[PDB]
């Protein structure tokens, strides 16, 4: 089998893509944020405190024919940014572009954080990690890739998000009309239940090449790229006024920037990030500091290749049994 859906943009920045996810029977639609850095599949829902909803589509597992409580599991998730929410679980019929997985663990938020909260249009979260970073107790749960994976034609995911645009989420094979050139993949670490990789260094503009091993997670749930403060002084460097900001919380560069593009390195092939990528806009409505897109990973504890990065490129999520990444230009 096969999947193949779109994913929208939630706003003009690029902020974070929504995918339609059907849970249920019949289907009810809701538009999920799919997140390669987590793993639980989680979703607004009748039992979400009252005032904790605001505009979302929720899920109400009464209404679905086939969906069965999970008697006794619980779920509870805090990402990085600060955010979280918990709840109990469901098994029921989840599909994602055509592709059906029957007994996903849907999870059901009875609480969620005000930063979800204050987000109408994402219904939750479709995690694509690693299995081994699933929330729910006392029975951990599988990802909708992982319960797809034996049925697909192939053991893989890709993501093509677009720049200020639409962009689509693969399942089971490979779009070879997607790309430019080749697709060079490269080694993954699920140590740490993430897709973890090391990138062969950087450039800044028409700079030269920096060949250094930069260990990060492919992570489509976080906007920005986050780095090493070393390497992103060194971007910033390039753009007359920029400079980290305390009380901001980033870099932060004049609106009137013109912005170098960023590559990074896969084996011996090269990720280009347009300058343009890298603009978040205004840091409050009309102001002329903007919010940059390469931002420090210091205290965050890894380096993050969120959308920035990955929007620049078509990438493969191969869940193999030894699993790896692939990137190609586009
Ligand atoms: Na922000």
Same mark, same amino acid.
């Given at each position: 089998?096969?999947?193949?859906?779109?994913?929208?943009?939630?706003?003009?920045?690029?902020?974070?893509?929504?995918?339609?996810?059907?849970?249920?029977?019949?289907?009810?639609?809701?538009?999920?944020?799919?997140?390669?850095?987590? %793993?639980?599949?989680? *979703?607004? +829902? $009748?039992? #979400?405190?009252? @005032?904790?909803? /605001? =505009?979302?589509?929720?899920?109400?597992? &009464?209404?679905?024919?086939?969906?069965?409580?999970?008697?006794?599991?619980?779920?509870?998730?805090?990402?990085?940014?600060?955010?979280?929410?918990?709840?109990?679980?469901?098994?029921?019929?989840?599909?994602?572009?055509?592709?059906?997985?029957?007994?996903?663990?849907?999870? %059901?938020?009875?609480? *969620?954080? +005000? $930063?979800? #909260?204050?987000? @109408?249009?994402? /219904? =939750?979260?479709?995690?694509?990690?690693? &299995?081994?970073?699933?929330?729910?107790?006392?029975?951990?749960?599988?990802?909708?890739?992982?319960?797809?994976?034996?049925?697909?034609?192939?053991?893989?995911?890709?993501?093509?998000?677009?720049?200020?645009?639409?962009?689509?989420?693969?399942?089971?094979?490979?779009?070879?009309?997607?790309?430019?050139?080749?697709?060079?993949? #490269?080694?993954? @670490?699920?140590?740490? =239940?993430?897709?973890?990789?090391?990138?062969?260094?950087?450039?800044?503009?028409?700079?030269?090449?920096?060949?250094?091993?930069?260990?990060?997670?492919?992570?489509?749930?976080?906007?920005?790229?986050?780095?090493?403060?070393?390497?992103?002084?060194?971007?910033?460097?390039?753009?007359?006024?920029?400079?980290?900001?305390?009380?901001?919380?980033?870099?932060?560069?004049?609106?009137?920037?013109?912005?170098?593009?960023?590559?990074?390195?896969?084996?011996?092939?090269?990720?280009?990030?347009?300058?343009?990528?890298?603009?978040?806009?205004?840091?409050?409505?009309?102001?002329?500091?903007?919010?940059?897109?390469?931002?420090?990973?210091?205290?965050?504890?890894?380096?993050?290749?969120?959308?920035?990065?990955?929007?620049?490129?078509?990438?493969?999520?191969?869940?193999?049994?030894?699993?790896?990444?692939?990137?190609?230009?586009?």
């Amino acid at each position: 089998s096969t999947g193949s859906a779109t994913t929208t943009p939630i706003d003009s920045l690029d902020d974070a893509y929504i995918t339609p996810v059907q849970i249920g029977t019949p289907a009810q639609t809701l538009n999920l944020d799919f997140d390669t850095g987590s %793993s639980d599949l989680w *979703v607004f +829902s $009748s039992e #979400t405190t009252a @005032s904790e909803v /605001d =505009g979302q589509t929720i899920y109400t597992p &009464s209404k679905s024919t086939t969906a069965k409580l999970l008697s006794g599991a619980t779920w509870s998730i805090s990402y990085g940014d600060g955010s979280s929410s918990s709840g109990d679980v469901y098994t029921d019929t989840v599909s994602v572009g055509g592709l059906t997985v029957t007994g996903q663990a849907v999870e %059901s938020a009875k609480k *969620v954080s +005000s $930063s979800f #909260t204050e987000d @109408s249009t994402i /219904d =939750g979260l479709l995690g694509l990690a690693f &299995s081994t970073l699933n929330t729910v107790s006392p029975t951990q749960q599988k990802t909708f890739f992982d319960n797809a994976k034996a049925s697909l034609d192939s053991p893989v995911f890709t993501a093509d998000l677009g720049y200020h645009a639409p962009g689509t989420y693969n399942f089971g094979f490979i779009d070879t009309t997607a790309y430019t050139g080749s697709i060079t993949y #490269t080694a993954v @670490s699920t140590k740490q =239940g993430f897709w973890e990789w090391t990138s062969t260094g950087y450039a800044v503009g028409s700079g030269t090449f920096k060949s250094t091993s930069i260990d990060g997670i492919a992570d489509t749930g976080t906007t920005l790229l986050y780095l090493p403060a070393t390497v992103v002084s060194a971007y910033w460097a390039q753009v007359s006024g920029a400079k980290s900001s305390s009380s901001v919380g980033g870099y932060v560069f004049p609106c009137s920037a013109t912005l170098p593009s960023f590559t990074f390195g896969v084996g011996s092939a090269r990720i280009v990030i347009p300058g343009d990528y890298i603009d978040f806009g205004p840091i409050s409505t009309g102001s002329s500091s903007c919010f940059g897109g390469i931002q420090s990973s210091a205290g965050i504890g890894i380096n993050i290749f969120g959308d920035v990065a990955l929007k620049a490129a078509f990438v493969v999520f191969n869940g193999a049994t030894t699993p790896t990444l692939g990137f190609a230009s586009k």
